[PDB]
Structure formats: structure tokens, C-alpha cells
Amino acid sequence: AMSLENVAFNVVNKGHFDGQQGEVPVSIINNTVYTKVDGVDVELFENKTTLPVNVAFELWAKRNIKPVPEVKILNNLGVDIAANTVIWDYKRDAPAHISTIGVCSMTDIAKKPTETICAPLTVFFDGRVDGQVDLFRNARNGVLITEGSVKGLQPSVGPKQASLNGVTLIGEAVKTQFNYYKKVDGVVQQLPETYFTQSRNLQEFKPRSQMEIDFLELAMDEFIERYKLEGYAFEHIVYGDFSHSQLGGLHLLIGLAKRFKESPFELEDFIPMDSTVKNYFITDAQTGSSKCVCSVIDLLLDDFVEIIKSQDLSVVSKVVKVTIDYTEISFMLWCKDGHVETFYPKL
Amino acid sequence: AMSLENVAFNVVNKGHFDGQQGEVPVSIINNTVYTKVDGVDVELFENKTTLPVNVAFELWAKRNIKPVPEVKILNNLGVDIAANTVIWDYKRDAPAHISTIGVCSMTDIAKKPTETICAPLTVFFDGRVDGQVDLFRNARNGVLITEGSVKGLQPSVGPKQASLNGVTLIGEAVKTQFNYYKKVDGVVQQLPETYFTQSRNLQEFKPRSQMEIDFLELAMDEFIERYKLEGYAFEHIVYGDFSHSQLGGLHLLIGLAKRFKESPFELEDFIPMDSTVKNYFITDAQTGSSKCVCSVIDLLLDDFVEIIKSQDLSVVSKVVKVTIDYTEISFMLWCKDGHVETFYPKL
Amino acid sequence: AMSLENVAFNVVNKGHFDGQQGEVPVSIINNTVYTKVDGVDVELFENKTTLPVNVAFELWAKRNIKPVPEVKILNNLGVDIAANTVIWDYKRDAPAHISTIGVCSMTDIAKKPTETICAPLTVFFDGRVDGQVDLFRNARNGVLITEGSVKGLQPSVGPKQASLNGVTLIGEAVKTQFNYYKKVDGVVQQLPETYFTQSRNLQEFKPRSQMEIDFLELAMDEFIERYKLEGYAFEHIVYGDFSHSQLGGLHLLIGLAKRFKESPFELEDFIPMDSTVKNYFITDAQTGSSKCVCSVIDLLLDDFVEIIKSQDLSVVSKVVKVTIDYTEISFMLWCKDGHVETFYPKL
Amino acid sequence: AMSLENVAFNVVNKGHFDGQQGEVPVSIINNTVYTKVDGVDVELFENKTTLPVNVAFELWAKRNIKPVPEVKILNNLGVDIAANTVIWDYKRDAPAHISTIGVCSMTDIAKKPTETICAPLTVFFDGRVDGQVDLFRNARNGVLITEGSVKGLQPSVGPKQASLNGVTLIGEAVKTQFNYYKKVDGVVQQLPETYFTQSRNLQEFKPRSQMEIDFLELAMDEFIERYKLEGYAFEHIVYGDFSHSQLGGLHLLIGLAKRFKESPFELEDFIPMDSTVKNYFITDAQTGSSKCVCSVIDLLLDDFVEIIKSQDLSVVSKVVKVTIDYTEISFMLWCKDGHVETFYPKL
Amino acid sequence: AMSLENVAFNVVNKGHFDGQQGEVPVSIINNTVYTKVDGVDVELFENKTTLPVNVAFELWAKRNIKPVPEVKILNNLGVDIAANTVIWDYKRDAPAHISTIGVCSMTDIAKKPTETICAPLTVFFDGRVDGQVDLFRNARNGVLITEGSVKGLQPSVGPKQASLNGVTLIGEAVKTQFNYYKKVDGVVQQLPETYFTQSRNLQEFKPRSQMEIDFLELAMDEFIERYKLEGYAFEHIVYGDFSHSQLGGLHLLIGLAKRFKESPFELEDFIPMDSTVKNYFITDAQTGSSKCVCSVIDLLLDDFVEIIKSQDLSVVSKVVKVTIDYTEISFMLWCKDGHVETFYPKL
């Protein structure tokens, strides 16, 4: 039987819900869950979601603590709901999906993914859990992830990294590379060929290729000449211009990291969530240059160089469609006199 | 096995906690408890107390639903806590006592009344529950109530009425008259002789003696002459004076009912709780006469007549101590030329 | 000197702030003020305003408890603020004015009415308080009320009733009729000749003239013939039409009381506030006839008859402006073939 | 056409209110504004102010995003309100002024600065906006800032730095130095000659002169001898004494940074707001030396040296008035035997 | 005398309550205390406790600002309440004890420690306050701390560090080493011989012995070969195993700091409170190794090697009881073939 006190007992004894028996005193005040330890109140959970505090507490205690795809990947694949698990969104401090299957009586729309209400929805299946591969095989719309290969389905190799308790990492002791499968209306889809965002963070940016190491260590002109990027506007697209009141270019995360190690500045993440492309209110503290909305994507610099070289520079103004993170991303390309003026992700 | 969902299931199915097994979905939002009935949220409880909402909900679901002494009686007896039950205060919309014994893990200071922490406290025992008379016999400080007589203890006959689910009544199908026993520091006390307030309500006042029937039906002068109350200031201290801006007298509830029948007015209960003496902000809508602090006691008119006749009229000013509801009530008496000027309960 | 605990002590001991010394323990949880009486929490005040809970509690404890003009009268006279007092609006359950003078440190814009910030504001002065008449004489914009006459100023006789602790009444033991004075930009104004709303309530409606007694007792036709109202659409304006799905007429409170005494119905006061003209969502429970916006004014039936008999009765459609409660009220008049079609207050 | 949904649309698409057309779904729960992005709720704004959540959200979305004077400068100049803009106070996380002009219908006291209610207030005008210089010329009380020079008024050169989106910076790509003008009762004032606070923070302290570089790098005695500050108590005033339980001196921010480089410590900003002089509860983690109220000012070390050399050493104890940030700052000076004992800003 | 406004005045002018006279305007909105400074609201306190906001604000303003034992020491010693002071728990952001003596009228159970209600409780006495040593001498259950020696009682030397305004430090300018005394039921106890935890922090870890310096600087194998720790499983117990999905060992804080220097990781403090043994949800960002519950204790490395060498290495499995911080800590010891398998604090 599911009880708030049992959930709190599991949290205080194991850090998350593990299906153990036991109760613990609980107080609920002002969107916060408290438990009494030695006659003194200790906070267990602060509700940051729009759900009721007890419902959110139960959903958070039942979050998946194995490595899972970043919620941006699930969004791009159209996942509506997860089967028998909770994907916690650590960017929003909330559950990734509004409804559940077989998790919480206050949010379940079904107990099993095989029920009728779930058929039109794209269900997330985890092949690491026994029986979920067969559930996906019988399901109408859904997305499957496995560590290895499943019989009779062609895998799509996903990102190297995954999310584990809200920290994104490429696994060494754990497998974070999954094979992705998708079915729409009963027919197994063939996922497109895509680039993947590196999901790196600005403050602890770490290079993942020799080219990124050079970009961080070298100066502008040396890097531009070493990789033959003379006609590709890297000094504006990637390095960023800080000479005018309006900030120029600066659409790759690695350029932001370069500037940050050079001189710190602050990003206003005015839509805090997980996306392939993020928009920031960027103020440069050294110069005062600023831009209200600056679209930033964190690609591997090698991949972005490949994309920028694979473009036709004869056009003046066009929209480039790049498949990144299993989704189509629109880039505006401006070329003049055989060289590009800007190349930024569209809004 | 104690759980919020189980408490809510008991409330939904039986109206109060009965110790049945089962669970229902619960939502807690803004000091309110909701449950899902056929996909929509139905409010079960609104926390009016200073306790956390879930704690207050559990305490309210476990209130005693048998006839119990009014909380004013328990207060006058010095009851600190009830043994293995919750006395709900329906005037404050809150539990009558701040701690419990063997009721709620968030508010219990002990599981049994025999614990050491309970020894200095005056515990309330209910002789209608098996084993409580022996618990009282072994207890150090406590108050016992029984339907009948217990061997070796002299009863104190209590009020005729009791409280049942928040409505005060003199029982016909149920017994509402109790025998009261009290122990202080291990020695059985002798409760004093007292009058009891009638706990009547202004809006639905009903007479309970022939004299009260006469008081309601007759006019002033004929009632005064029929009971020889000529020298006892009844026309001021009972009927009320409405000729000046400051309201005069009007200290008996029956006088309030008399005035209310002919002309309704406004009572502001600025300290809403249960007391032998109540203080009201009274404004008379017919005349505009008003008084900020009008102390009101609801005695049987016969008892008040007995009290007023048993007074010494030779004094000019003195404080009269009357035992009402097992407590000492101070009355201010003003006598002039051998007749009463005022007789009102002190503050 | 001013403290929340002292305010609570005054409320507990006197029902309102009286400037007595003493403190009492206070708790503030969820827009509610609690005090501890015998180890138990008793609610003193629930904040229904948009102010902070402690500020609202202090303002409510310092409300005027003498008879005062109704809030609608002060609004029509342009009163912005009261001098050294709080006018509590019992319709809104909030202070009538947003700033104070010499009342609350969290709300005062000045300590005295004579300061410069108060000069452009219309201040309310109470001649029953010593010195306020001279303050008004020196003030630039203000409104003065007195019981009697002041030297050198021509009174405007106000309504018969006033408000005392939130109950409207014509005073007998206390004087509720005031003389009104108004100064604009330093020059004493001449208040217009006006009608006054009776401020009566629907459920407990009392006639104030023989004509209203006849209206309540007689049937329609006898009343119409007795007062020669044959060409004045009293069938529609006053009595109300309940034959169509859309409710007809019914713009006088006495008509609503007439309908209510025989068949109760539902009023939705969707703008709960004090005004000369009230708008209600009327649903007639007997017939189902309903109207979303039904403007209602509570005039004395004699005065409304006088108004309706002073109309031209020849033009087809016009707006007639009547001075009621010191303000101009627009009525739409429809006349056809020399008789009134409808006559309702404009929105 | 002002609307909460339109404000949220502007925030979602541009990070601030820009006047674009569009709507997004909005939820308001518990002083937080949420919008729905792809079926999940994303928090846009958390209300930290005393205003209603929607009002605060609208005011925050309409904050000035160009460089503006720091809030303390405006406070020292007596600015009551800004004309047609919102100055956001990022220290308090709230609007800098309580009323607006032509910004929000819930907080506006006027639509244009030329209205009568604004005349007694000191309005803030921004010369970078067309028409505001003329508005200031016509205004009775106001403060004007311009990038350049206005015809017929003598500028007062302001601080080098300004605030831009809540980060203080000396602008390179944008101009952050303003000319200040002030009118009182219609007459153009002559602003005093003042020092300016450097508005630096502890963690990222940077020198702004060769003397500060020496102070950060040199040892105590080396610096004292190099700049001949032998009789000026720098070892107590600036460096700070950490030998007793009560912390000694340490009234300049550069000294705090000097100590912080060696051993970090705790600053408790118990009045979090912007002011020329800040009071901190300082506990030194290395030694345990602490002081409850440590007044700190961030002057350029050169300017403070000039101030302390400009003093008269013969007096024993006097109050020194220094004009800093357009306001008078009282310093307490103690001298003994012709040398300074202590020199701290008064409380 | 005790007022919320006076408490706020003391906080504004002194940073804490000092018993100065004065009042300041206060607003209370949503568990936050605001004061008005120059017409704008500045937040003074945000309530993080389960108490009412004003009660918590008063308790926080009256916290002890002198060095005090860490609340874990008081908990292990059984302290129920402090005498005439408030111990603030900065881990919980709440008062360390639920009741007070002579502090706050809303939370006091007595005014003096000598009253009867306090007799069965273990009261905390501070010998640095005059009269408290005598109060402890007369008390029945209590704990005493003094800087020096008291006549006729054998001291127990406490930890080197204490807490000062929420920061733990070994005092140089102030004494943080206390002598501890304890009485149970009137008889002076003899405290056991104990180890003490170092209370150090992960991110700013500092070695406090030559052995810890070597542990931080050396490599694993070099350190093990020194100090002769070959048969004591330090590789697992102290350094931590990061090769499997489940994190191995890592039960000493110094090992956490060692790993953190080379590669930062995530600690989830799911029970945030002060304790001798802490449980963390640790996920290693470099490898992905993680463990839901990691018992961590911050002992001096010398003390820990002494404990582990003091063990009987012939048993296969047993529970070792170590007295740390005046409490018994159970360690599970696993040994095979005469060498340790693992040695972790029991959970």
C-alpha cells in the first residue's frame, strides 16, 4: 500500500523510494515536506513543481536513479510518458512528464502500458528492465532504449553521455550509450542520422577533441589558419564580437567557455529547461556588450566545422536544416562574396 | 500502518477514522486536503488550526464522536491532555489539547498514560472505555468521567448536557450526564459544589424552567413583581438598558435572547473559544446603543436569582466568588441604599 | 510604543485598540493572527485585504467604533483619506482608504493633516473629535462632519442613518445624522441638494413610510391606483417581470423585498463593494427568469415616485441625472405615447 | 492592450518586455509565474517583492535593460520615481521605486510626468530617451542623466561605472558615465563635489590604481612606508585587527579583499540593499575574531588616502563630513598625540 | 516590552537582538519579515522552520553569537533545551531545540531553569554566563560547559573547534575548547573517553596532521606502504572504489576530499542535519559510479588508523563500538584471512 509516511521512511533510510516497509512522522507546511528526527523537524523536500506537494514528493522519491537519456532527447523523440518509472527533470526541478503509468495513484492514467488510454501516446520503454522490450514490441507508439541489440530491430546509436541523478556524464563504470528504437502507429521507424549536443556546462567546460583543445589554448588567428577556416566567419560565429553595445555572434558553447576563462560574465537563462538550442540574456561584464536573446548550441567543434564546411556559400540568405539530437534545427546562413557573414540557429 | 491515505479512506467511507484498511488518492494544497472521486477533486478538510495540515487532518479524523464534556468544563478542571482520544474543540475548530497520548506520531508525547512524561500532567480518562478507570486509579494527576458509579470514589454530578459531534445537547437516547472525579498529586480530590452554565445558543434559545418561560413571555414589570425581584436591579443587569450610547447591563444570555426576539442585533465574539464567561462586542441595531466588552454568562435564571438573593446588600462594593462550572467566578456587586446597583461578572 | 503584541493585547481585553499597556503572545500563520489563551491558540483576525497581515490587523484594531458615514457617502464626496482614524469598510472587509494619517507607521503618509503631502488630498475630518473643525478650517481640501452647527459655515444635512461597527442604523441612543461640509482648493463648497439611499438589506427589509407599507401589503393594481402611477411603468420598473427567460425591470430594492417575502431567489454580488447603485446577477428560483446585470438602487419609494413624476414624459429616450448620495446618477428614460416604457439607472 | 499573457509571451521570446504581440498560457501558483512549453510547466519568475505576483512580474519584465545609475546613486539624489521606465533593484530583487509613471496600471500614479501628482516628487529622467530632457526642463523636481551635454545646464560628472542588467561595470562598448542634473522646486541645483564608491564585490575584487595593486601585493609595513601612512592608523582602519574576540577596524572593502585572499571569512549582509556605507556581521574563520556591525565603504584607496591626509590631526574626537556618492557621510575620527587612533564611518 | 518591531529594530541596527530600545516598521508576507528603509521594503528574515514566521524571527534574532558547541555534540549529550539562550542550528536553518527557557513567550515552557517543568529535562548551561554554574550545580539533569575549571567537578575536555555564527572554527582570538560536565538525576556523571569528529567541509578541506598532509599529497600505494597500512583495506575503506556501478567504500571525509581535488562529484545530503555520521547519495561524475547511502564520518586520519589497528583481526564479522563525539558509533568489521575486508559505520 502506497503511503506518504512509507515514502518518507524510504527517503530517510535510502535517499529514494526502494519499496521498503516502515513509517516515519511527516509534516507538510508551505510546499515543504518535513520529518521528525529526534524531536526536531528536518526538511526532506521542497516542492518546486506545479503539482501538489505530496504528489510531487512521491514522484521525486520514485525517480529513476539509473542512467537515463537527457530529457531533451526524449522531447525530441516525442516521448509523452514513461512506462513504470519517473524521469525527473533536474533542469526544471519537476517530473519530465505530466502523467505516469503504474507509479502514483494521483497521476497514473493506467497501471500498465498495454491499456487502451496509452495506445495513442508515445511511451518510453527501458530495455534494462525485464519485460519492457516485449512491451515495446507490442506497443503502438513508443521509444525503446537498450544497452545492446534486440532481435530483428536496427538500432540507432545515441549520445555518448546520459543523465545519472541529475549529473550528465559519459559512463565508465556504467553504460550511458543506448540504442534507440521508435515505433509510430505500430510501424518501426528508422531514426534519422543526427549530430548530438555535448551537454557540457559553461563553468566546468572540458574539451573532447584535439581541435577543442587547440581552440581553448590557441589564439584566434592561429586557430583560424590551422584549420583553414578563413572564409567561415568563426571570429563572429564562434568567438563572439564584444565591440558594440549589442553582442555579436557567439552561438557555440565553446566560445562562451573561451570568453569565460578570459573574462567572467553572466547568462540569464530566462526559460530554464532542457533544449538542443538554448537562449540566453548575455551581458559581458568586461565590455558591457549585451544581447537580449542569444541562441547557443553545444556541438562538438569538429561537428560544427563539418556542418559549416558542408554548406553552399553561393546563396545570399537561406535556412539550413540540420538534424541534431533526433530533431531538425534551422540555421540562418548569410553569405556575401563567397564567404559567410553569419550562421546562427533560428528561433 | 498509520497513513494519510488510510485516514482519508476512513473519512471518505465512514466520515471519521474507524481503523478500516484501504487507501484513496490524496492531494494537499493550501491547508486543504483533497481526494479524487471519479476523476475530480473533492475537499475533505480545511485546516483552521496552527498545526500542519496533515497532522490536523489526522487529529480531526480521530476525534471522539461519543458525547464528551464541553471543553470549558475540561479547562476549568485543568485537563492538560486526553488519554487515547482526541477532544475536538468545535468553537476553535481545532483540537482541544496540544499533545496527545497514543493517537498521532507527530503529536504524541507518550503511547500510554502510564509513561513518566504524563505523570505531572492532568490526564482526561473516559470511564466508558475499558480499562480507563484503572488507569485513573493508578494515575497521579487526572480527571475521570463515568456514566455510573465507581467503587470507592464519591462522584461529582456534572452538567446535564454534553457535546456530541460539536452540538451541545441533553441526551435522551444517550447519556450526557457524567460523574466527575479528580486526582491531584495522587490524592483523590473533593470537587466543590457548583452551578453549571446551560451552554445555550442565542439564536435558538429555549427556556428550561417555568421561570424562564415567564421571563420570555411576560413583560418587565409583571415578571419583576411575580418573583419579588424589586430590589435586585434586574431591569438593568438582566433586561439591559438601551437608552444611552453605552449599553447598560445585559449580562445574562436569557436577556440577550429576550432582546433578540423583538429586535435582532450584533454579537462580535472577538475571542472565539469556550468559556464560562463570554465577552462580546455588542451593538444594538434598533437604538445604536453599544458596549465594547459585555461579559455574558448563561446560567439558569433560577440559579442566578438564587445567587442574587443570597447576597449581602449592606456592602457598598465587593467581589463575589461564585463556583460555576467547577471554577471560581468573580462578580462585582454594587449595592446602594440596600438595593443592587449592578451585579456583573468580573474580567 | 506601537507593537503587534500590544495591539493584540488591546484586542483581547477590549475588542479593539484602546491604547492600554500590556502584551500578549502572538502567532502569525497564513494571513491569520493567533494569540495563545491557556496554552491554546485562538484566532483573532483573518486578513481579507491585500495588505500584509500584521498591517491589516493593526488597521482593523484601530477602526472607528463611533457612528460614521457609510463608505459610499465618503466615496461620493471624494474623500481620499481620514484624519487620525481608520474607516473600516465592512462590505470589502478592508480599510476604506489605502493611506492613513497618524495611525500606522507602515501606512501613514503623514502624522498630521496639516503636512504638505496631505494638502492636495481630500481629508475626512470628524467634528466629534476636538480640534478637527479647526483642522478643516485650515485645510485646503477636506470634508467635515459634525453633530451640530459650526460657526460661519452652512451645513448640508446628511443621511438619517450611519454605520456603527459595520451595522447601518438610524440612531436613537446615539446621533447618526451629520452636517456635511466640503472644501475644494481652500474654498468652502455648497453641497448640492440630494436624495439619500436608505441602505437597507434585502432579507430584513423594513418600510420607512406609509407608502412602502402599502406597497408591501397590497397587490399591484391597488397600489398603482391608490397613488395614480398608471402611466409610470411601475409594473416593470419596480415590481419586476418574471415571464421571460430574461428578467425584466426590478430596479428598486423594495421590489426585490416584495418578491423575496413570497418567493426567495439568488443574488450574486459580483462586485462586493459599497455604492449608490448596485449591480447583481439575479436568478429567480420560482420561474427561472434571470438577468446578468440588474442595477438596483434603494431609494425611499416616496422619493422615487417624486423622481418619476418630475420627468418630462414626452421625449422618447433621454438620460436624466439625479443627485443621489451627493453624486450624479444617470437614469435611462424610455417613454412611448406619453407613458413610461422603462426607467433604469445607467451603468 | 496590456496583458499578463502578452507580458509572458514577450519574456519567453525576448527575455524582457519588448512590445511584441502574442500570448502564451500562464499559471500562477505560490508567488511564481509559470508558462507551458510543450505540455510541461516552466517557471518564468519568482516573486521576491512585497507586491502581488502578477504586478511584480509585469514590473520586472519592463525593467530598464540599458545601463542605468546604481540604485544608491538615485537614492542619494532623492529620486522618488522614474519617468516611463522601471529601475530594477537587483540587490533587493524588487523594483527600486514603489510607484511608476506610464508603466503598469496597477502601480501608476500618472501616465505622463507632467501631471500634477508628479510635481512634488523628484522624477528620474533619462536623456537617452527622446523628449526626456525637455520634460526635465519643464519639471519642478527631478534628476536628469545624459551621455553628453545639454544646452544651458552645467553637468555634474557622475561615477565611471553603471549598472547593466544587474551587473555593475565600467563600459567600453557602451557608455556608463553620465552627466547628472538636479532641480528642486523648479530651480536647477549645483551638485556638490563628491567622491564615488567603486561598487566592487569581495569575491572578484580588482585593483583600479597602482596604489591598490601595491596594497594587494605588498606587505603591511612595506606599503605603509612606501606611501608614508605612518601616523594614519592604516594597520587598524584598513588592514583590520584579528587578535581580540572583537574584530578591529577593517572599514575599507580593499582590506576585506586583502584578508579574503589569505583566509576566507563570513559576511552577513543583514540589511540587503544598496547604500554608500554597508553594515556587515563579520566573523573571521581563521581566528574567530568577529564584530556584529562592521561598517564598510568601497572607496578607491587613493581617494581614501586623500581624505585621511586632508584631516586635522590635532582634534581629539570629531565628526568628519565627506561628500561621497552625492551624499554626506559622517566619519568618526579619533586622534591621539598627533596620530590617528581610528577613522570609521558613523552608524 | 518584548515586541516584534523592537526585535526588528535591534536586527536592523545591530544584526541581532541586543536589548536596545526602538521600533521599526515591519511587514509580514509569506514567511518573510520585511522592514521599510526609505520607503522601500527590505527583507530581514525568511522563515525556513516549522514555527510561525514571527516566532522564528524572534528566536533567530536572539541566537547565541558567542562560540557554542556544535549541535551534534549537544544531541549526543542529550540536551533537550538551553537555559536563557537560543542555539541556532545552521544546518537546519532552525532553532536547535523546540522549547526555550526565558526567551520567547510563544515558546517558553519556563522563565528559569529552576522551575519544576524543567527538572526532568537535560538543560544546557553556559559557564561563560554568570550564575549558570550554580544553576547547573542545583539542577537535576543538565550539561555544563566552561572555559576553565569549576571547583569540585572533573572536566571532560571537548572538541577543539566550536561554532560561531554558523561557521565552525578552532579559535585563536576566542576560546572554542570547552570543559563538559553532565548530571543525570542529580548525580554528576563521568563522561566517557571519546574521539571527536573534525567537522571539516568537503570543498575547503584542510589537513590537520602530518599524516593527512601525506595522504593528500602522496599516491595511494606510497601512503599505504608508509604507515604500514597493508592489511587494513584502506584502498576500499578510505580511497574509494570507482570501478563498478555501485560505489565502493569511501567512508572517511578525507578520502572524499582527495577524490574531489582530482575530480569533483555530487553529494546529495538527503537528511540535512548535524550528525556524527552523515549519509550521502554520492554519484561520481568522472566514472558514473554511485551509491545511494554512503556513511561518511570526519575523523582525524590518525585517530581512524588508531581505531582500525586497535581491532581484533581474527573475527570474521562483528560490530565494533567506538565512542565518538560522546556517543557510541557501531562499525561493521569484515575480515578474511587475517586482513580487513571492509570497516564502515553501521546504518
Residue numbers in the entry:
A (entry chain E), B (entry chain B), C (entry chain F), D (entry chain D), E (entry chain A): -1 to 345
Paper text:
The NSP15 endoribonuclease enzyme, known as NendoU, is highly conserved and plays a critical role in the ability of the virus to evade the immune system. NendoU is a three-domain 34 kDa protein that was demonstrated to form a barrel-shaped hexamer in solution by the assembly of two trimers. The oligomerization is mostly driven by the contacts of the N-terminal (ND) and the middle (MD) domains, while the C-terminal domain (CD) carries the canonical catalytic residues from the endonuclease family. In terms of substrate specificity, NendoU of the coronaviruses is described to cleave a great variety of single- and double-stranded RNAs in an Mn2+-dependent reaction, by hydrolyzing the 3′ end of pyrimidines, with a strong preference for uracil, and to release 2′,3′-cyclic phosphate and 5′-hydroxyl ends as products.
During our cryo-EM studies, we were able to elucidate multiple high-quality models of NendoUhex in different pHs and buffers, with resolution ranging from 2.5 to 3.5 Å. Based on our biochemical results, we performed cryo-EM data collection of NendoUhex in buffers where the enzyme showed maximum activity and reduced activity, such as PBS at pH 6.0, Bis-Tris at pH 6.0 (two more active conditions) and HEPES at pH 7.5 (a less active condition), detailed in Supplementary Table S1. In PBS with 150 mM NaCl, NendoUhex activity was also significantly higher at pH 6.0 (v0 = 430.4 ± 15.0 RFU/min) than at pH 7.4 (v0 = 74.2 ± 3.0 RFU/min). Despite their similarities, models showed consistent differences in the switch region. However, in cryo-EM models obtained in PBS at pH 6.0 and Bis-Tris at pH 6.0, we saw a less mobile and more open conformation of switch regions, much more like known crystal structures. In fact, this open–closed form model seems to agree with our biochemical data showing that the enzyme is far more active in acidic than in basic pH, where the switch seems to be found in the closed conformation. A general observation we made was that particles from samples in basic pHs, such as HEPES at pH 7.5, tend to be individual particles, while particles from samples obtained in more acid pHs, such as Bis-Tris at pH 6.0 and PBS at pH 6.0, tend to be arranged side by side, forming filaments, which is a common mechanism of allosteric control of enzyme activity. However, the most drastic similar effect was obtained when we added the DNA oligo(dT)30 to the samples in Bis-Tris at pH 6.0 and in PBS at pH 6.0, where we saw the immediate formation of 2D crystals of NendoU in the frozen grid, which somehow had induced the same pattern of arrangement of particle in all directions.
